[PDB]
Amino acid sequence: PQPPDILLGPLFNDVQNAKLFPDQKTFADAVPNSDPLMILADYRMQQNQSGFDLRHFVNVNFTLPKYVPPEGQSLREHIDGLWPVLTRSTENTEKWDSLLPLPEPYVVPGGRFREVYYWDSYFTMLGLAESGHWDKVADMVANFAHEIDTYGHIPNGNRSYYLSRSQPPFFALMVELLAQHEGDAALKQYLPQMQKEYAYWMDGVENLQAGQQEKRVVKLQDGTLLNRYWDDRDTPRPESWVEDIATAKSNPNRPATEIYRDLRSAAASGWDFSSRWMDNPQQLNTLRTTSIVPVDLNSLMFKMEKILARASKAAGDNAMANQYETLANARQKGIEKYLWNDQQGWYADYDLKSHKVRNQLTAAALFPLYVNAAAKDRANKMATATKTHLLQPGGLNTTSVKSGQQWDAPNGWAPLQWVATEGLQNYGQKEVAMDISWHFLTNVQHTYDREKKLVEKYDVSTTGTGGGGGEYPLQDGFGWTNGVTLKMLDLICPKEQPCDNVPATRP
Numbered sequence: 391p392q393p394p395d396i397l398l399g400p401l402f403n404d405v406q407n408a409k410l411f412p413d414q415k416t417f418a419d420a421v422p423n424s425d426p427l428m429i430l431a432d433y434r435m436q437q438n439q440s441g442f443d444l445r446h447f448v449n450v451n452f453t454l455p456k457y458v459p460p461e462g463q464s465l466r467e468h469i470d471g472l473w474p475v476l477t478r479s480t481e482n483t484e485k486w487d488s489l490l491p492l493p494e495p496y497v498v499p500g501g502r503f504r505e506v507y508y509w510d511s512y513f514t515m516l517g518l519a520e521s522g523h524w525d526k527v528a529d530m531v532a533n534f535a536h537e538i539d540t541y542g543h544i545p546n547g548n549r550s551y552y553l554s555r556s557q558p559p560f561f562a563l564m565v566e567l568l569a570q571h572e573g574d575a576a577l578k579q580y581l582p583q584m585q586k587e588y589a590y591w592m593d594g595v596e597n598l599q600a601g602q603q604e605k606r607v608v609k610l611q612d613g614t615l616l617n618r619y620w621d622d623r624d625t626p627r628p629e630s631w632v633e634d635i636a637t638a639k640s641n642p643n644r645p646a647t648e649i650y651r652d653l654r655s656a657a658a659s660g661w662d663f664s665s666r667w668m669d670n671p672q673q674l675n676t677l678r679t680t681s682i683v684p685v686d687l688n689s690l691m692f693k694m695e696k697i698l699a700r701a702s703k704a705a706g707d708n709a710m711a712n713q714y715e716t717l718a719n720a721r722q723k724g725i726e727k728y729l730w731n732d733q734q735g736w737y738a739d740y741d742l743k744s745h746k747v748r749n750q751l752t753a754a755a756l757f758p759l760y761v762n763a764a765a766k767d768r769a770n771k772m773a774t775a776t777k778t779h780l781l782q783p784g785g786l787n788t789t790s791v792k793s794g795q796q797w798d799a800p801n802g803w804a805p806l807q808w809v810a811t812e813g814l815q816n817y818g819q820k821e822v823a824m825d826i827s828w829h830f831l832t833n834v835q836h837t838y839d840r841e842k843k844l845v846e847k848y849d850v851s852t853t854g855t856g857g858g859g860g861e862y863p864l865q866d867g868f869g870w871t872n873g874v875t876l877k878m879l880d881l882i883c884p885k886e887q888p889c890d891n892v893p894a895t896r897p
């Protein structure tokens with residue numbers, strides 16, 4: 391599958407640059423009505439002719455992409471009822487569609503996100519599992535396994551323009567989730583695809599020397615092996631074409647290709663975009679994702695290694711189980727050395743430019759707790775950092791910096807709420823965990839009471855309003871919000887007396 395900027399070459403660039411559609415993703419999802427080679431030749435003939443109209447040419451040659459709860463419907467009921475609305479089934483696609491086929495139905499986030507997304511799906515699957523839709527969980531794992539075998543990795547989503555990258559790696563955790571229902575059979579079944587995904591993340595370690603980086607692998611000067619986010623292309627994102635061109639244009643002191651690589655790699659991080667990656671929080675054109683070793687990614691790699699060990703052991707391959715534990719142990723040592731800021735007292739990303747742990751506290755700092763990599767003293771310090779700096783009245787803040795980007799204050803994102811809660815639980819920090827859950831759930835409920843929907847991210851400074859920021863508007867649905875809300879709704883009420891709306895009083 392060739393991404394649309396390649397498939398449709400100059401025409402793609404021209405349509406995007408013309409801003410015919412208010413979202414650059416719209417034309418990225420256009421389906422050619424005939425062979426792109428024919429369309430391009432026709433366009434070449436017409437484009438310089440007197441009276442040529444690009445919009446009419448597009449309308450001819452492409453097909454462009456195409457609810458309110460009943461009175462008193464509870465939050466839980468609304469969520470359960472929305473799953474089919476968010477479910478898509480594309481076993482086959484029309485020719486030249488940027489949508490990539492998947493063997494089973496899948497849940498998409500909502501709104502402009504009309505394809506499956508990698509890390510969203512984990513948190514969506516937690517909700518599907520909580521509500522007994524294990525068939526759909528199994529379908530999703532199967533879909534991702536298929537993507538691993540077909541492409542060698544899980545793309546950011548099932549679009550041609552996402553093949554160049556992945557997203558935060560949750561597939562091993564998806565397999566572990568499935569094994570909560572199916573037992574170790576699930577780990578053993580999908581061991582081949584977990585190993586294949588690990589091969590993707592680690593591709594480049596062979597022949598890598600200390601102080602070098604290759605693709606998603608970094609080897610520090612002392613030999614420590616860690617991963618980073620990394621897209622295989624260094625061109626504007628087809629789905630955000632004009633944005634990326636404008637971002638690069640705005641900073642002539644950097645090569646455009648480096649800015650494009652870093653924009654794409656921030657998309658791969660899931661955190662498109664954030665002060666977390668930026669020298670200057672007020673200028674996206676200073677982002678330097680590929681020079682930053684992320685604490686979340688490396689926590690997820692540790693978990694992947696641990697799960698690979700567990701699956702290998704279950705399968706009866708002891709040499710591979712031992713090897714993976716050895717790898718995990720090395721990873722954990724790397725996290726504790728290079729991804730802990732001892733001056734500030736929190737986990738943090740590592741800076742390959744300055745060769746120093748970064749100073750900024752972000753919600754990614756809870757990931758070492760979430761995966762049980764953290765020392766207990768450091769987990770307790772993280773509980774304190776969370777209470778002091780990140781816990782707000784409406785949930786866990788993503789960062790403390792209001793940059794105008796969406797992965798930043800004052801926005802709270804469902805997945806980060808859950809990672810934090812679960813990480814804190816893993817170290818017995820139940821009070822802070824419950825406050826995050828209650829505060830965020832109150833936000834979700836309040837917003838639902840007012841707007842009759844769940845949304846992509848929330849303003850945690852108060853309750854009852856969705857968040858904003860970045861290059862597109864707040865989206866509605868919303869897969870991981872719905873999934874995390876269900877999980878948290880179960881944590882907060884007895885279950886001998888389960889709640890269908892978030893109560894005003896803690897049981």
Ligand SMILES: OC[C@H]1O[C@H](NC2=N[C@@H]3[C@H](S2)[C@@H](O)[C@H](O)[C@]3(O)CO)[C@H](O)[C@@H](O)[C@@H]1O
Pocket residue numbers: 415499503507508509510546627629630657658659660661662846861862
């Ligand atoms: O506006 C274009 C971008 O849209 C997506 N970006 C984001 N979408 C939501 C956030 S940020 C991400 O972490 C999740 O996957 C998301 O909830 C759904 O896609 C996509 O993942 C990125 O790869 C795209 O470049």
